[PDB]
């Protein structure tokens, strides 16, 4: 595999069509899904030349851990849909690559099993039925050694996925929510923040005022994100709001971005627009579907090579230098 | 049906080609027809998160009536072209859905029959031959219980519909103007305003100065509209003028928009740009053609679900909140 | 025929391919030829409503003559390439329609014969070999009753037409320059201006400073024009420079535009951007090829209908009102 | 051949596919390769009219030599891949055309042999293993009569060429680096500048601050360039940074540009944006592949004709006049 696109072809071969569609699809007309890619393709980097590259490093420090790349595996529910080893295959490859893995509330293997793989994981939270029950999931995650709570804040309910409706898609009986919902509010965020000393990361922020309020609320990070085009159809891509958000929070929390990251060059673009790190969702699942744990290992090795290549060609010996690169919008 | 586009396919199947073309077509090269869709597709919404959604409501108050959605059925002439029950099927479904229905001057069932369906309808006026005759239509509508006069102001004469010319299209002998024209001016508006206490809504405004003059003229609303691309070919889409118009009228009248609204997400975009409500034309006729009254019921149920979904995913418990959303223009 | 595009199809049927290419083609990669259309398609008009349309007139006064439309037939060399009656067929139809016809220096019928058709024609000048010889052509035109000299200023030599090179195109032996070249300069303009009291119109101006200098030089008009994409490939379309030029000349001369005008709506766009009138080139030749004089008559009747339709739908009772319309750039 | 595109078709016919791909390809998704063309196609020139064209000249003075055109042959490694005479065929044609030829560090004929062809060549430097060894290459070039050192500064290592990876491409055993690498820094530039009195030209500058620093470093020129889309994928095209760079250096060094120049009109656009001259890479190799030395001669004759045509149609008797032309960005 020499690009992330090789793995999508491989995953489309192997998966049942309705599972490929569950993975690939967005809500509505998929305008926001498409716009995530169009928005990244319009961004051009202005590289710097002739800088010292003797010790290029792609490492970052985030939420009190060193990560090998400015990247984490996005939360993706029900990974046994894609491969029998599901979350354990992905988490093992992420650990070995030095990349944080986000354990999902809707994981198809229990969060304690996935956390036992090691690799200092994160835990993604959907607000439940109940404050008390939500907080038990948080405490479970913390007790199991998760290092951050990624609170998803853009899913008061799930978006309308027309592919899934047209397919009549439902979980196979062999895929269950192994850890076993009400709309979250800022009060829910405060309840979580009071319940844990782990950093709380709010995933699904797009409005500048919501990024500022996240800082004021004591979030340790946000993920600027339209949920891969799966929630509001017509929501702006995160990458289009990232620069304005980074300026507004003025270093008050980590600012991650996701949606359409498909190469180390895209990682570089996100960094140059100010992101602390990116999440990568669908490509990780393509690699899982294509070749299990080894597939995800090859994907993360390929991304690491592409990030290092892009950084050095742009004159950046560190991710901090990459955040100081300038960009130019072009027409595609 | 899971999208408005499913119904267009169904209507294209059933209608004679020349009737489908009468419905689908625009004037000239159909530049303005296409631009209505392109303009909406360029608009992205910036959703808000973590707001209270305990009692999301899509209702609005407009022209002294509560409506179930920020939407009305646009005036579309000669609806017996599309289904034998014509206007009565549409008006019955609109009533049952709580959505205003606009009775046309060129309806193929008399306005008194359609008004007897109930549902507090509106009446669309074309200026006639004569001030005295125009005012009789207005008084008829008011006597029959119509609640607003939608005065069409963009049709001094009808635009040049090349599909209809190429088809040699004419009304079947079984379709007639059951209520039975000179260019309207601001004097005509004043004559109507003096003749009725119903709110007068000027449909087909695109220039900012004309929206201000409509307020000064005592209009209770305007519809920002290029008539579905059927009048001047090369007229700007209403959605491109809406924000400037809303700012100029500064709450002095209701500001509706139409042209290309094809989902609850599009309704949300129009609201976020400042519209009080939208009109929907061709999709209602697709549903009528596809399945009569039941077809229109299913369309309005689908739109209601999509509007509620879009509002809540954008953090809006009310249409007023949706009007306070910000938008971003993207490239598509 | 219900659009200018119907006539292009008809002309492509009848003409030899290499003659169709001589007519249709541009220089280089035809970037400027294509851009003339793209530039017009991006322009949207903001129509006004509810104005008095009791006496809509498309007439203008230009160069001391009333014209029926804000339009003239562009200079197109060698019209016997397209039909045996050549220039005489076109000039007769233009006369009957009340539209100025531009007699070409390279006409395939002598300028005195074409002028004898009547209709108060204009004469297009290419600068010759010699000041004395150029001025004799001017005097010939004036003696024959031409009413303006259209001095082409964008052809120091002819552009590189790759279609013609690939075809090995040359004039049939039955087509000759019946009136029988050095680069023109501002000194040439002054020599012409001193030799005639007819208005001198400089055709092929694109730079704002050249439009101002044309006024200072005593031009009575300019044509803002990239010569139909046939001269510099990569020259900006005239329609993209028109508004800036109209503002710069501040009424000091007539400002015409050409390039890609293909409907009455396009005429309206050019007027709304400030043009006094347009020229139309290739469509006139399509109609000539398709059906001789009668073909050109039908084209001019169709354009007249489309101009009147567009003006009235935009609320303009006169071309002056149309010049006061505002426009909005859109994306197509 | 009437356009550069004719030669690409001819080269694609004759070359082995994997050699055509080595030549044609870029890094990554080839976004920057494509953007070089898209960026040029968006630029329109505003031509001037009626200027004296009695002695149009395309000559420039650069690095102390008169050149016949504002153009040089770009450095392209391993030209025996494309034709058996390789660099000698190209250098002979360049000499005969009066166009500088850039001898590559990775030439497949030794730099002394190519320099013996004559024509006052330039020498392109890749920084080596060692300061001492790099400086020996520079001194070799100077001793052989090269007139400028083109130091490539955008290749700390080579970009990831996916076509070459997919093809498993490697040099034929009959193609070698006949002159026989560490990342260059500003210290390397200073070492070169101190070692030679020849002008040092830094090739691969895109950031404005790097262009200013190049002047401060004593560069005699820069080439604003993303290396033909072969280095960082997502690097901005040089033509998009050229105007800002020309303004920033304020005449302190020559500013060349490359990437996608495919006609004399493109040369004119680059000049109008402020370039001193352009480099042309792939088209020269197409002509070499198609027809050896004679092929390159025909290409350079065609470019010379197109540059002279474009200049005169734009009213420029000299390249200096062309740099004073204004441009307008359009949509394509
Ligand atoms: C199949 C699928 C399942 C997902 N499940 C969740 C989830 O349970 N929680 C969540 O916060 N995000 C979920 N996401 C969104 C991802 O975390 C991420 O925001 C989106 O996929 C990132 O975009 P990318 O896939 O383009 O890289 C899911 C995404 C996909 C494709
Ligand atoms: C077939 C047809 C007939 C129409 N008849 C009228 C009419 O009689 N009066 C009027 O004001 N608008 C008329 N309209 C315009 C609609 O009210 C509305 O402005 C346009 O259709 C809205 O756009 P949409 O169809 O894209 O939703 C008609 C539209 C169509 C398609
Ligand atoms: C076949 C052909 C011949 C032309 N000959 C002349 C000419 O002799 N003199 C001149 O000023 N313009 C000439 N023109 C340019 C037209 O006057 C006009 O600028 C261009 O065609 C207008 O664009 P349109 O064809 O898109 O309407 C010619 C155009 C064509 C297509
Ligand atoms: C096959 C190939 C080999 C190249 N080798 C070199 C090289 O050794 N050194 C260098 O500075 N540029 C090299 N270049 C880049 C060119 O000098 C130039 O920047 C790029 O090709 C210019 O773009 P164009 O090919 O679109 O005209 C190479 C380009 C190609 C296509």
* CATH code, domain carrying D258: 3.20.20.70
Pairing of strands B221-224, B254-257: parallel
- Given a contact cutoff of 8 angstroms between Cβ atoms, the answer to whether C213 and C244 are in contact is no
Chain breaks in chain A (C to N over 2.5 A) after: 180
The number of angstroms, rounded, from the C-alpha of D182 to the middle of its chain's C-alpha atoms is 22
Q: Across the interface, do C49 and B159 touch by the CB < 8 Å criterion?
A: no
Rounded CA separation B240/B236 (Å): 7
Q: A267 to chain B nearest CA, in Å?
A: 21
Which residues have C-beta within 8 Å of that of residue A36, sequence separation ≥ 6? Answer: A226, A228, A229, A237, A238, A239, A259, A260
DSSP C206: -
The set of residues, in sequence order, having a beta carbon less than 8 Å from that of A143 and lying 6+ positions away, is: none
Does C232 sit within 8 Å of D314, measured CB to CB? yes
d(CA C293, CA C275) in angstroms, rounded, equals: 28
Interface with C, mutate which of B43, B125, B234 (most C CBs under 10 A)? B234
3-state helix, strand, coil in chain B (%, to 5): 45, 15, 40
Q: Does A1 touch chain D (CB under 8 A)?
A: no
Å from CA of A185 to ligand 1 middle: 20
Tokens representing D257?
Answer: 């540009």
CA-based nearest residue to A264, from A254, A278, A251, A250: A278
Cα–Cα distance, C202 to C216 (Å, whole number): 12
Distance CA A112, CA C214 (A): 82
Q: Is the CB of A229 under 6 A from ligand 1?
A: no
How many structural domains comprise chain A? Answer: 1
Q: Are B201 and C40 in contact (CB under 8 A)?
A: no
Gap between the Cα atoms of C251 and C246, Å rounded:
7
Catalytic residue, chosen from C37, C193, C203, C227, is C227
Beta strand pairing call for A149-152 and D65-67: unpaired
Residues followed by a gap in chain D, C→N > 2.5 Å: 180
Label the pairing between strands C326-329 and C277-280.
unpaired
CA distance C311 to C303: 12
Mutation for testing the C interface, residue in D39, D40, D43, D47 having most C CBs under 10 Å: D47
What Cα–Cα distance (Å) separates residue D17 from each residue in B102, B191, D22, D24?
A: 65, 77, 9, 10
Q: How many angstroms is the resolution?
A: 1.7
Residues of B in contact with C314 (CB under 8 A): 232, 235
Kindly provide the b/e burial profile for residues A89-118, where b requires at least 16 CB atoms within 10 angstroms of the residue's own CB.
Answer: bbbbbbbbbbbbbbbbbbbbbbbbebbebe
**What residues pair up with C326 in beta bridges, in sequence order?**
C46
Distances (CA, A) of C297 to A85, B120, C99, C198, C294: 77, 53, 11, 28, 5
Name every protein residue with a CB atom under 6 angstroms from any ligand 3 atom.
C 22-23, 36, 74-77, 104, 106, 124, 152, 203, 225, 227-228, 230, 258-261, 279-282
Q: Which of D230, D237, D270, D289 to mutate to test the pocket of ligand 4 (most atoms within 8 A of CB)?
A: D230
- Tokens representing A222 are 């946000």
Of the candidates B97, B34, B38, the residue with the CA atom closest to the CA atom of residue B67: B97
- CA separation for the pair C69, C261 (Å, rounded): 14
Using a CB-CB cut-off of 8 Å, the residues of chain D touching C233 are 263, 265, 310
List the residue whose alpha carbon is closest to atom 11 of ligand 3: C152
D295-298: list long-range contacts, CB under 8 Å, 24+ apart.
Answer: D295/D7, D295/D10, D296/D89, D296/D90, D296/D93, D296/D94, D297/D93, D297/D96, D297/D97, D298/D1
Say which of D2, D305, D330 has its CB closest to residue C35.
D330
Q: Which of D136, D96, D128, D131 is nearest to D112 (CA)?
A: D136
Mutate to test the pocket of ligand 3, among C41, C105, C281 (most ligand atoms within 8 A of CB): C281
C and A touch with 3+ CB pairs <8 Å, answer no
Structure-determination technique: X-ray
> Residue D204 — left, alpha, or beta (φ > 0 → left; ψ -120 to 50 → alpha)?
left
Q: After which residues is chain C broken (C to N over 2.5 A)?
A: 180
Number of CB atoms found within 10 A of residue A213's CB = 19
As a whole number of Å, the CA-based R_g of chain D is: 19
- Other residues' Cβ atoms within 10 Å of the Cβ of residue D239: 29
User: What Cα–Cα distance (Å) separates residue A288 from each residue in A12, A14, A85, A293?
Assistant: 12, 11, 9, 6
Q: Do chains A and B touch (3 or more CB pairs under 8 A)?
A: yes
Q: Do C232 and D47 touch (CB under 8 A)?
A: yes
Chain B residues within an 8 Å CB radius of A234 = 43-45, 265-266, 268-269, 310
Which distant-in-sequence residues (6+ apart) come within 8 Å of B168 by Cβ?
A: B18
Q: D120 in the Ramachandran plot: left (φ > 0), alpha (ψ -120 to 50) or beta?
A: left
Nearest to C235 among D47, D305, D309 (CB): D47
Task: Say if residues C157 and C183 touch (Cβ distance below 8 Å).
Answer: yes
**Burial of C194 from C-beta contacts in 10 A (0-12 / 13-18 / 19+):** exposed
List, by residue number, the catalytic residues of D: 227
For residue B152, the ligand 2 atom closest to its alpha carbon is 11
* Ligand nearest to the Cα of B123, by number: 2
CA distance A223 to A27: 19
Q: C with B: 3 or more CB pairs under 8 Å?
A: yes
Angle subtended at Cα C166 by Cα C165 and Cα C168, rounded to the nearest 5 degrees: 60
- Give, for A192, the enclosing helix (H) or strand (E): helix A186-195
Task: Test B50 with A153 for CB contact under 8 angstroms.
Answer: yes
Size of chain C in residues: 332
- The DSSP H or E segment spanning B136 is helix B131-143
CA distance B106 to chain C (A): 20
Q: Where are the alpha helices (DSSP H) in chain C?
A: 4-14, 17-24, 31-41, 86-97, 111-116, 131-143, 162-167, 186-195, 208-216, 238-249, 264-272, 282-313, 319-323
**CA dist A51 to A312, A313, C269, Å?**
9, 10, 53
Asked if C4 and C302 count as a contact pair (C-beta separation under 8 A), the reply is: yes
Q: Cα separation of C263 and D75, whole Å?
A: 50
Taking the CA of residue B49 and the nearest CA in chain C, the distance in Å comes to: 31
Tokens of A316: 């950046």
Residues of A acting as catalytic residues: 227
Please pick, among B92, B227, B230, B282, the residue that the annotation labels catalytic. B227
Place of tokens 């003028």: B241
In the numeric block, the tokens 């299990």 are attached to A292
Q: How far is the CA of A76 from the centre of ligand 1 (A)?
A: 5
Contacts of C120 (CB under 8 A, 6+ apart): C65, C100, C145, C147
Centroid of chain to Cα B228: 9
Cβ under 8 Å to C: D residues 27-56:
41, 43-53
Q: Which two tokens stand for residue C47?
A: 């129509």
Residues in chain B: 332
CB C269 within 8 A of CB C240: no
Q: Atom 28 of ligand 4 has which residue's CA nearest to it? A: D76
Pair D145, D217: CB distance under 8 Å: no
Give the number of other CB atoms < 10 A from CB of residue A61.
Answer: 11
Partners of C28 on chain D (C-beta within 8 Å) are 3, 263, 265, 306
Does D184 touch chain A if contact means CB atoms closer than 8 Å? yes
Ligand positioned closest to the Cα atom of C259: 3
D232:A326 CB<8 A: no
C-alpha to C-alpha distance for C23 and A45, rounded to whole angstroms:
44
Is C235 in contact with D330 (Cβ distance < 8 A)?
Answer: no
Residue B328 in contact with partner chain A when CB distance is under 8 A: yes
Do D46 and D327 touch, CB atoms closer than 8 A? Answer: yes
- How far is it, in rounded angstroms, from Cα B255 to Cα B249? 8
Residue to mutate among A6, A47, A52, with most D CBs inside 10 A, is A47
Domain with C93, as residue range(s), is 4-329
- Smallest CA–CA distance, residue B153 to chain C, in Å, is 6
For C288, the token pair is 């000539």
Q: Are strands A122-125 and A102-103 parallel, antiparallel or unpaired?
A: parallel
Closest residue by Cα to atom 29, ligand 1, is A76
Closest residue in chain D to residue C332, using alpha carbons only: D331
Residue of A313, A327, A328 to mutate, interface with D, max D Cβ within 10 Å: A313
Task: Give the integer Cα–Cα distance in Å for B260 and B229.
Answer: 10
Whole-number Å distance between alpha carbons of C245 and C221: 12
β-sheet bridge partners, residue B149: B123, B200
Q: What angle do CA A236, B235, B188 make, to 5 degrees?
A: 120
Q: Which of A312, A326, A330 sits opposite D156 (nearest CB)?
A: A312
Backbone torsion region of residue C86, taken as left when φ is above 0, otherwise alpha when ψ lies between -120 and 50, otherwise beta: left
CB pairs under 8 A between A and D: 104
Distances (CA, A) of B76 to A322, B19, B67, B81, B151: 57, 13, 20, 11, 13
Which ligand sits nearest to residue D285's alpha carbon? 4
Ligand 1 contact, A73 CB (< 6 A): no
Judge whether C108 and C128 are in contact, CB under 8 Å: no
């Amino acid at each position: 595999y020499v690009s992330l696109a090789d793995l999508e072809r491989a995953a489309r071969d192997v998966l049942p069509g309705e599972i490929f569609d569950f993975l690939a699809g967005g809500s509505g007309t998929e305008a926001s899904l498409v716009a995530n890619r169009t928005a990244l393709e319009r961004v051009f980097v202005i590289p710097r030349m002739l800088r010292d590259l003797t010790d290029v490093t792609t490492e970052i420090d985030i939420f009190g851990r060193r990560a090998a790349l400015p990247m984490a595996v996005a939360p993706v529910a029900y990974q046994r849909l894609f491969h029998p080893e599901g979350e354990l295959a992905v988490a093992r490859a992420a650990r070995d690559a030095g990349v944080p893995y986000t354990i999902c509330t809707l994981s198809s293997v229990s969060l304690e099993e996935i956390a036992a793989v090691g690799g200092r994981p994160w835990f993604q939270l959907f607000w439940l039925r109940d404050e008390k029950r939500s907080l038990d999931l948080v405490r479970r995650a913390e007790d199991a050694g998760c290092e951050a709570i990624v609170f998803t804040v853009d899913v008061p309910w799930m978006g309308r996925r027309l592919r899934d409706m047209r397919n009549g898609f439902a979980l196979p009986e062999w895929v269950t929510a192994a850890n076993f919902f009400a709309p979250a509010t800022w009060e829910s965020v405060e309840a979580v923040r009071a319940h844990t000393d782990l950093p709380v990361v709010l995933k699904g922020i797009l409005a500048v005022e919501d990024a500022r309020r996240a800082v004021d609320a004591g979030a340790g990070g946000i993920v600027v994100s339209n949920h891969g085009g799966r929630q509001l159809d017509g929501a702006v891509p995160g990458i289009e709001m990232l620069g304005e958000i980074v300026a507004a929070v003025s270093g008050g929390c980590e600012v991650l971005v996701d949606g359409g990251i498909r190469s180390g060059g895209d990682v570089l673009k996100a960094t140059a627009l100010g992101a602390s790190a990116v999440l990568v969702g669908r490509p990780v699942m393509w690699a899982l579907a294509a070749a299990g744990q080894d597939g995800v290992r090859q994907l993360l090795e390929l991304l690491a090579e592409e990030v290092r290549d892009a950084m050095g060609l742009a004159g950046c010996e560190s991710v901090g230098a990459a955040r100081r690169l300038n960009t130019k919008l072009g027409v595609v």
